[PDB]
Protein backbone atom coordinates (compact mmCIF):
# COMPACT_ATOMS: atom_id res chain seq x y z
CA UNK A 1 0.00 0.00 0.00
CA UNK A 2 2.13 3.50 -1.18
CA UNK A 3 -0.84 5.48 -1.96
CA UNK A 4 -3.63 6.13 0.11
CA UNK A 5 -6.65 8.06 -0.78
CA UNK A 6 -6.41 11.66 0.26
CA UNK A 7 -8.94 12.41 2.69
CA UNK A 8 -6.32 14.22 5.14
CA UNK A 9 -7.43 17.58 3.14
CA UNK A 10 -11.62 16.49 3.22
CA UNK A 11 -11.91 16.16 6.64
CA UNK A 12 -9.05 18.52 7.96
CA UNK A 13 -9.65 21.46 5.54
CA UNK A 14 -8.79 24.86 6.99
CA UNK A 15 -12.16 25.61 6.66
CA UNK A 16 -15.70 24.25 4.41
CA UNK A 17 -17.31 25.52 1.66
CA UNK A 18 -20.99 26.99 1.94
CA UNK A 19 -24.01 24.89 1.50
CA UNK A 20 -25.35 26.50 -1.24
CA UNK A 21 -22.07 26.02 -3.17
CA UNK A 22 -21.14 22.74 -1.59
CA UNK A 23 -17.40 21.55 -2.63
CA UNK A 24 -17.14 18.77 -4.51
CA UNK A 25 -13.84 16.51 -4.82
CA UNK A 26 -12.61 13.60 -6.59
CA UNK A 27 -11.11 10.39 -5.23
CA UNK A 28 -9.86 7.93 -7.53
CA UNK A 29 -6.79 5.86 -7.52
CA UNK A 30 -6.32 5.31 -4.45
CA UNK A 31 -6.09 2.92 -2.14
CA UNK A 32 -9.16 3.53 0.38
CA UNK A 33 -8.36 3.27 3.68
CA UNK A 34 -11.74 4.18 5.83
CA UNK A 35 -10.40 2.87 9.33
CA UNK A 36 -8.45 6.59 9.77
CA UNK A 37 -11.46 7.98 9.90
CA UNK A 38 -12.73 8.05 12.96
CA UNK A 39 -9.65 9.47 13.95
CA UNK A 40 -9.84 12.21 11.64
CA UNK A 41 -13.09 13.86 14.38
CA UNK A 42 -15.69 12.60 16.69
CA UNK A 43 -18.05 11.69 14.27
CA UNK A 44 -21.78 12.86 15.70
CA UNK A 45 -24.21 11.13 12.46
CA UNK A 46 -21.89 8.75 10.65
CA UNK A 47 -24.34 7.03 8.65
CA UNK A 48 -24.38 4.89 5.50
CA UNK A 49 -27.01 4.33 2.93
CA UNK A 50 -26.71 1.12 0.05
CA UNK A 51 -23.69 -0.49 1.93
CA UNK A 52 -22.81 -1.55 5.68
CA UNK A 53 -20.06 0.77 7.16
CA UNK A 54 -18.43 -2.68 8.70
CA UNK A 55 -17.96 -3.93 5.13
CA UNK A 56 -16.39 -0.53 3.46
CA UNK A 57 -13.13 -1.80 3.23
CA UNK A 58 -14.17 -4.59 1.70
CA UNK A 59 -15.76 -2.86 -1.28
CA UNK A 60 -14.22 -1.82 -4.52
CA UNK A 61 -15.79 1.36 -6.77
CA UNK A 62 -14.58 3.19 -10.02
CA UNK A 63 -14.62 6.93 -8.40
CA UNK A 64 -15.69 8.24 -4.86
CA UNK A 65 -17.45 12.14 -4.54
CA UNK A 66 -16.93 14.16 -1.78
CA UNK A 67 -19.38 16.54 -1.01
CA UNK A 68 -17.98 18.86 1.88
CA UNK A 69 -20.19 21.95 3.36
CA UNK A 70 -20.81 23.27 6.73
CA UNK A 71 -25.16 23.64 7.51
CA UNK A 72 -26.54 24.11 11.05
CA UNK A 73 -28.01 21.50 13.45
CA UNK A 74 -31.46 21.29 12.67
CA UNK A 75 -30.53 20.95 9.23
CA UNK A 76 -27.88 18.11 9.36
CA UNK A 77 -31.18 15.31 9.34
CA UNK A 78 -32.39 16.74 6.35
CA UNK A 79 -29.25 15.53 4.23
CA UNK A 80 -30.95 12.04 3.49
CA UNK A 81 -32.72 10.86 0.23
CA UNK A 82 -35.77 11.34 0.40
CA UNK A 83 -35.98 14.33 2.27
CA UNK A 84 -37.77 17.47 2.25
CA UNK A 85 -36.79 21.27 3.53
CA UNK A 86 -34.20 24.09 2.82
CA UNK A 87 -30.90 22.25 2.43
CA UNK A 88 -32.54 19.17 0.85
CA UNK A 89 -34.66 20.97 -1.54
CA UNK A 90 -33.07 24.27 -2.78
CA UNK A 91 -29.07 24.12 -1.52
CA UNK A 92 -27.92 20.24 -1.97
CA UNK A 93 -30.37 17.23 -2.70
CA UNK A 94 -29.37 13.74 -2.95
CA UNK A 95 -30.60 11.09 -5.19
CA UNK A 96 -33.58 8.94 -4.23
CA UNK A 97 -31.02 5.79 -4.97
CA UNK A 98 -28.76 7.17 -3.20
CA UNK A 99 -25.63 4.63 -1.94
CA UNK A 100 -22.61 6.21 -0.38
CA UNK A 101 -21.90 7.54 3.76
CA UNK A 102 -22.67 10.69 4.94
CA UNK A 103 -20.52 12.07 8.35
CA UNK A 104 -21.58 15.21 9.84
CA UNK A 105 -19.58 16.84 13.01
CA UNK A 106 -20.23 19.20 15.32
CA UNK A 107 -17.39 22.21 14.70
CA UNK A 108 -18.00 24.85 17.07
CA UNK A 109 -14.80 25.51 17.78
CA UNK A 110 -13.80 26.13 14.21
CA UNK A 111 -16.97 28.09 12.94
CA UNK A 112 -17.94 30.58 15.78
CA UNK A 113 -16.05 33.80 15.94
CA UNK A 114 -18.37 35.07 18.54
CA UNK A 115 -18.80 38.26 16.20
CA UNK A 116 -21.22 36.41 13.84
CA UNK A 117 -19.22 33.65 11.01
CA UNK A 118 -21.41 35.60 8.24
CA UNK A 119 -18.96 34.27 5.56
CA UNK A 120 -21.38 30.97 5.29
CA UNK A 121 -24.17 31.23 3.57
CA UNK A 122 -27.57 29.11 2.51
CA UNK A 123 -29.75 29.35 -0.58
CA UNK A 124 -33.44 30.94 0.62
CA UNK A 125 -35.45 31.12 -2.44
CA UNK A 126 -35.24 29.51 -5.86
CA UNK A 127 -37.55 29.11 -8.80
CA UNK A 128 -37.77 25.39 -8.83
CA UNK A 129 -36.84 22.30 -6.35
CA UNK A 130 -33.05 21.46 -6.84
CA UNK A 131 -32.50 18.71 -9.24
CA UNK A 132 -30.44 15.94 -7.65
CA UNK A 133 -26.53 16.82 -7.60
CA UNK A 134 -26.55 19.58 -8.71
CA UNK A 135 -25.31 23.21 -8.09
CA UNK A 136 -27.00 26.22 -8.31
CA UNK A 137 -24.30 29.70 -7.41
CA UNK A 138 -26.68 31.54 -9.01
CA UNK A 139 -27.14 35.15 -7.73
CA UNK A 140 -29.95 36.49 -9.27
CA UNK A 141 -32.73 38.61 -7.55
CA UNK A 142 -35.41 36.48 -7.14
CA UNK A 143 -39.20 37.70 -7.55
CA UNK A 144 -42.04 36.85 -5.32
CA UNK A 145 -44.85 38.53 -7.22
CA UNK A 146 -45.57 39.68 -10.51
CA UNK A 147 -44.05 42.61 -11.37
CA UNK A 148 -40.35 43.14 -12.64
CA UNK A 149 -37.88 43.00 -9.98
CA UNK A 150 -34.13 43.62 -11.37
CA UNK A 151 -33.04 44.38 -8.42
CA UNK A 152 -34.04 44.08 -4.81
CA UNK A 153 -37.57 45.17 -3.41
CA UNK A 154 -40.71 45.13 -1.57
CA UNK A 155 -41.25 41.52 -3.54
CA UNK A 156 -37.63 40.66 -4.69
CA UNK A 157 -35.38 39.45 -2.52
CA UNK A 158 -32.01 37.99 -2.40
CA UNK A 159 -32.15 34.21 -2.90
CA UNK A 160 -28.81 33.68 -0.39
CA UNK A 161 -28.99 34.14 3.67
CA UNK A 162 -25.69 34.48 5.95
CA UNK A 163 -25.54 31.95 8.61
CA UNK A 164 -25.55 33.95 12.07
CA UNK A 165 -22.79 31.17 13.58
CA UNK A 166 -22.04 32.16 17.56
CA UNK A 167 -21.05 29.73 19.93
CA UNK A 168 -23.56 30.84 22.45
CA UNK A 169 -25.93 28.94 20.66
CA UNK A 170 -27.26 25.65 21.28
CA UNK A 171 -26.60 22.51 19.85
CA UNK A 172 -29.21 22.43 17.62
CA UNK A 173 -27.96 26.15 16.01
CA UNK A 174 -24.10 25.06 16.36
CA UNK A 175 -22.45 24.77 13.35
CA UNK A 176 -21.57 21.42 11.81
CA UNK A 177 -19.56 20.25 9.16
CA UNK A 178 -20.96 17.63 6.65
CA UNK A 179 -18.82 15.46 3.84
CA UNK A 180 -20.99 13.21 1.65
CA UNK A 181 -19.04 10.37 0.13
CA UNK A 182 -20.71 9.38 -3.01
CA UNK A 183 -19.74 5.78 -4.69
CA UNK A 184 -19.83 5.11 -8.04
CA UNK A 185 -18.95 2.75 -10.74
CA UNK A 186 -20.09 2.87 -14.44
CA UNK A 187 -18.09 0.88 -16.52
CA UNK A 188 -14.29 1.30 -15.78
CA UNK A 189 -12.54 -0.98 -13.77
CA UNK A 190 -12.50 0.03 -9.98
CA UNK A 191 -9.16 1.75 -8.81
CA UNK A 192 -10.16 2.54 -5.93
CA UNK A 193 -10.54 -0.18 -2.97
CA UNK A 194 -9.56 -1.53 0.56
CA UNK A 195 -5.94 -2.78 1.97
CA UNK B 1 -40.27 34.65 27.10
CA UNK B 2 -42.62 36.98 26.73
CA UNK B 3 -41.04 40.23 25.99
CA UNK B 4 -41.12 43.45 27.92
CA UNK B 5 -41.99 47.33 26.74
CA UNK B 6 -42.77 50.43 28.83
CA UNK B 7 -46.62 51.06 28.71
CA UNK B 8 -46.26 54.33 27.06
CA UNK B 9 -44.14 57.05 25.88
CA UNK B 10 -45.03 60.83 24.95
CA UNK B 11 -42.26 63.21 23.85
CA UNK B 12 -42.62 66.68 21.72
CA UNK B 13 -43.23 66.56 18.34
CA UNK B 14 -39.95 66.61 15.88
CA UNK B 15 -38.25 65.03 18.68
CA UNK B 16 -36.07 61.45 18.50
CA UNK B 17 -37.59 59.01 21.11
CA UNK B 18 -36.30 55.39 21.86
CA UNK B 19 -38.32 52.29 23.01
CA UNK B 20 -36.80 49.68 23.95
CA UNK B 21 -37.90 45.87 23.93
CA UNK B 22 -36.18 43.52 26.63
CA UNK B 23 -36.30 39.63 26.82
CA UNK B 24 -32.24 35.93 20.35
CA UNK B 25 -31.10 37.60 16.98
CA UNK B 26 -33.93 37.87 14.87
CA UNK B 27 -36.03 41.09 16.09
CA UNK B 28 -38.89 42.55 14.20
CA UNK B 29 -40.80 45.74 14.86
CA UNK B 30 -44.45 46.60 13.87
CA UNK B 31 -46.58 49.76 13.83
CA UNK B 32 -50.51 49.41 14.49
CA UNK B 33 -52.80 52.49 14.41
CA UNK B 34 -56.82 51.68 15.23
CA UNK B 35 -59.12 50.27 12.77
CA UNK B 36 -56.08 48.14 10.83
CA UNK B 37 -53.64 45.82 10.51
CA UNK B 38 -50.41 46.55 11.94
CA UNK B 39 -47.73 47.25 9.78
CA UNK B 40 -43.98 45.84 9.31
CA UNK B 41 -41.55 48.31 10.10
CA UNK B 42 -36.53 57.84 10.70
CA UNK B 43 -36.69 54.94 12.11
CA UNK B 44 -32.87 53.33 13.05
CA UNK B 45 -33.27 49.66 14.79
CA UNK B 46 -30.45 48.60 16.91
CA UNK B 47 -29.91 45.40 19.01
CA UNK B 48 -27.90 44.79 22.42
CA UNK B 49 -27.97 41.13 23.53
CA UNK B 50 -31.40 40.38 24.92
CA UNK B 51 -32.58 44.39 24.32
CA UNK B 52 -33.42 45.86 21.29
CA UNK B 53 -34.18 49.38 20.03
CA UNK B 54 -35.92 51.51 17.84
CA UNK B 55 -35.61 55.35 17.65
CA UNK B 56 -37.87 57.45 15.89
CA UNK B 57 -36.69 60.89 13.99
CA UNK B 58 -39.11 63.45 13.21
CA UNK B 59 -42.07 62.85 15.22
CA UNK B 60 -45.43 63.73 13.86
CA UNK B 61 -49.01 63.67 14.32
CA UNK B 62 -49.77 60.54 11.92
CA UNK B 63 -47.16 58.68 13.72
CA UNK B 64 -49.42 58.21 16.74
CA UNK B 65 -49.85 54.53 17.12
CA UNK B 66 -48.88 51.35 18.92
CA UNK B 67 -46.04 49.87 18.35
CA UNK B 68 -45.07 45.94 19.30
CA UNK B 69 -41.87 44.31 19.46
CA UNK B 70 -41.74 40.41 18.00
CA UNK B 71 -38.53 37.37 17.96
CA UNK B 72 -39.66 35.12 15.15
CA UNK B 73 -37.02 32.69 16.48
CA UNK B 74 -36.85 29.12 15.12
CA UNK B 75 -40.77 28.43 14.79
CA UNK B 76 -42.25 29.81 17.08
CA UNK B 77 -42.80 34.14 17.79
CA UNK B 78 -43.37 35.97 20.89
CA UNK B 79 -44.84 39.39 20.83
CA UNK B 80 -43.89 42.34 23.36
CA UNK B 81 -46.73 44.12 25.59
CA UNK B 82 -47.22 46.78 23.18
CA UNK B 83 -45.97 50.71 23.51
CA UNK B 84 -48.32 53.03 22.47
CA UNK B 85 -46.45 56.21 21.72
CA UNK B 86 -47.80 60.04 22.40
CA UNK B 87 -47.43 62.53 20.35
CA UNK B 88 -47.71 65.98 21.60
CA UNK C 1 -50.09 41.34 -2.38
CA UNK C 2 -53.14 40.92 -1.10
CA UNK C 3 -54.77 38.28 2.28
CA UNK C 4 -58.34 38.15 2.59
CA UNK C 5 -59.45 36.54 5.72
CA UNK C 6 -62.86 35.27 6.17
CA UNK C 7 -65.49 32.77 7.63
CA UNK C 8 -65.82 34.71 11.49
CA UNK C 9 -68.59 35.04 13.29
CA UNK C 10 -70.41 34.58 16.32
CA UNK C 11 -70.35 30.99 17.59
CA UNK C 12 -71.46 29.25 21.24
CA UNK C 13 -68.69 28.12 23.13
CA UNK C 14 -67.39 24.66 22.46
CA UNK C 15 -68.17 24.73 18.71
CA UNK C 16 -66.03 24.24 15.68
CA UNK C 17 -65.66 27.13 13.40
CA UNK C 18 -63.06 27.39 9.76
CA UNK C 19 -61.37 30.76 9.20
CA UNK C 20 -60.31 30.66 5.48
CA UNK C 21 -56.95 33.11 4.59
CA UNK C 22 -56.65 33.72 0.45
CA UNK C 23 -53.57 34.90 -0.75
CA UNK C 24 -52.93 37.04 -3.63
CA UNK C 25 -50.18 38.72 -5.92
CA UNK C 26 -47.21 36.42 -4.73
CA UNK C 27 -45.96 33.00 -4.86
CA UNK C 28 -47.43 30.63 -2.41
CA UNK C 29 -45.17 27.96 -2.29
CA UNK C 30 -42.10 29.94 -0.85
CA UNK C 31 -43.76 31.58 2.45
CA UNK C 32 -44.75 30.68 5.80
CA UNK C 33 -47.68 31.62 7.25
CA UNK C 34 -48.68 32.46 10.45
CA UNK C 35 -51.86 33.13 12.52
CA UNK C 36 -51.96 35.86 15.06
CA UNK C 37 -55.03 37.09 17.18
CA UNK C 38 -56.08 40.09 18.91
CA UNK C 39 -58.48 40.76 21.62
CA UNK C 40 -60.35 43.95 21.91
CA UNK C 41 -58.66 46.18 24.27
CA UNK C 42 -55.54 44.08 24.11
CA UNK C 43 -52.38 43.66 21.85
CA UNK C 44 -51.64 41.02 19.78
CA UNK C 45 -50.95 37.74 20.52
CA UNK C 46 -49.62 34.54 18.16
CA UNK C 47 -51.83 31.61 17.61
CA UNK C 48 -50.38 29.33 14.75
CA UNK C 49 -47.39 28.94 12.31
CA UNK C 50 -46.67 26.82 9.34
CA UNK C 51 -43.70 26.09 6.98
CA UNK C 52 -44.07 26.27 3.54
CA UNK C 53 -44.49 22.45 2.90
CA UNK C 54 -47.11 22.15 5.86
CA UNK C 55 -45.09 19.63 7.59
CA UNK C 56 -44.04 21.52 10.53
CA UNK C 57 -47.05 23.24 12.56
CA UNK C 58 -46.34 24.76 15.49
CA UNK C 59 -49.06 26.24 18.14
CA UNK C 60 -48.73 28.31 21.30
CA UNK C 61 -49.37 26.38 24.48
CA UNK C 62 -52.77 28.42 25.45
CA UNK C 63 -54.48 26.19 22.59
CA UNK C 64 -53.23 23.18 23.24
CA UNK C 65 -53.94 21.47 19.81
CA UNK C 66 -57.16 22.59 20.16
CA UNK C 67 -56.86 24.11 16.48
CA UNK C 68 -55.61 22.78 13.02
CA UNK C 69 -53.93 25.32 10.54
CA UNK C 70 -53.23 23.58 7.29
CA UNK C 71 -52.53 25.11 3.80
CA UNK C 72 -52.69 23.60 0.17
CA UNK C 73 -50.63 24.52 -2.96
CA UNK C 74 -53.94 23.20 -5.09
CA UNK C 75 -56.00 26.48 -3.87
CA UNK C 76 -53.34 28.48 -2.41
CA UNK C 77 -55.06 29.53 0.68
CA UNK C 78 -54.08 29.02 4.24
CA UNK C 79 -56.95 27.35 6.65
CA UNK C 80 -57.85 27.19 10.51
CA UNK C 81 -60.65 24.86 12.38
CA UNK C 82 -60.93 26.08 15.54
CA UNK C 83 -62.31 23.83 18.25
CA UNK C 84 -63.71 23.95 21.84
CA UNK C 85 -64.03 27.76 21.66
CA UNK C 86 -63.97 29.63 24.84
CA UNK C 87 -64.83 32.91 26.17
CA UNK C 88 -61.45 34.46 26.24
CA UNK C 89 -60.66 33.52 22.24
CA UNK C 90 -63.00 35.78 21.02
CA UNK C 91 -60.67 37.77 18.70
CA UNK C 92 -60.05 39.53 15.53
CA UNK C 93 -57.47 37.56 13.85
CA UNK C 94 -55.01 38.21 11.19
CA UNK C 95 -52.86 35.79 8.81
CA UNK C 96 -49.89 37.07 8.04
CA UNK C 97 -46.56 35.84 5.61
CA UNK C 98 -42.75 35.36 7.33
CA UNK C 99 -41.02 37.03 4.41
CA UNK C 100 -37.55 37.76 4.65
CA UNK C 101 -38.31 41.52 3.54
CA UNK C 102 -37.05 43.01 6.81
CA UNK C 103 -34.00 44.38 6.64
CA UNK C 104 -32.89 45.82 10.41
CA UNK C 105 -29.90 47.84 11.10
CA UNK C 106 -26.20 48.09 9.05
CA UNK C 107 -26.01 44.38 8.76
CA UNK C 108 -27.64 44.78 5.11
CA UNK C 109 -24.13 44.31 3.75
CA UNK C 110 -23.40 41.53 5.95
CA UNK C 111 -26.87 39.70 4.42
CA UNK C 112 -28.66 38.97 7.21
CA UNK C 113 -32.68 38.46 7.19
CA UNK C 114 -35.09 39.31 10.13
CA UNK C 115 -37.77 37.05 9.05
CA UNK C 116 -41.15 39.14 9.96
CA UNK C 117 -45.01 39.64 9.08
CA UNK C 118 -44.43 42.30 6.39
CA UNK C 119 -47.98 41.67 4.98
CA UNK C 120 -51.65 41.42 7.44
CA UNK C 121 -55.04 40.80 5.88
CA UNK C 122 -58.08 42.73 7.24
CA UNK C 123 -58.76 40.24 9.58
CA UNK C 124 -61.54 38.33 11.04
CA UNK C 125 -63.47 38.29 13.67
CA UNK C 126 -64.40 35.28 16.20
CA UNK C 127 -66.67 36.04 18.96
CA UNK C 128 -67.94 32.98 21.14
CA UNK C 129 -70.83 33.60 23.63
CA UNK C 130 -74.25 32.79 23.60
Known amino acids: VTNLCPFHEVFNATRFASVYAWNRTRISNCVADYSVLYNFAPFFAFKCYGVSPTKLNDLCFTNVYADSFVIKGNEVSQIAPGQTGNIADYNYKLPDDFTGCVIAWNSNKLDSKHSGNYDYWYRLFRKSKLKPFERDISTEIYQAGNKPCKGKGPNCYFPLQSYGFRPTYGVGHQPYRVVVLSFELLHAPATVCGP | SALTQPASVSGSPGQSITISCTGYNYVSWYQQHPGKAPKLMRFSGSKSGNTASLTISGLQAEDEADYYCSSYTGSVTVFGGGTKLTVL | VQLVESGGGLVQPGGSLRLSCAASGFIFRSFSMSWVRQAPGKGLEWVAN????????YYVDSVKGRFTISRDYAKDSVFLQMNSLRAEDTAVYYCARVGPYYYDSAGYYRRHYHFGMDVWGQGTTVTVSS
Open chain 3, 50 to 57: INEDGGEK
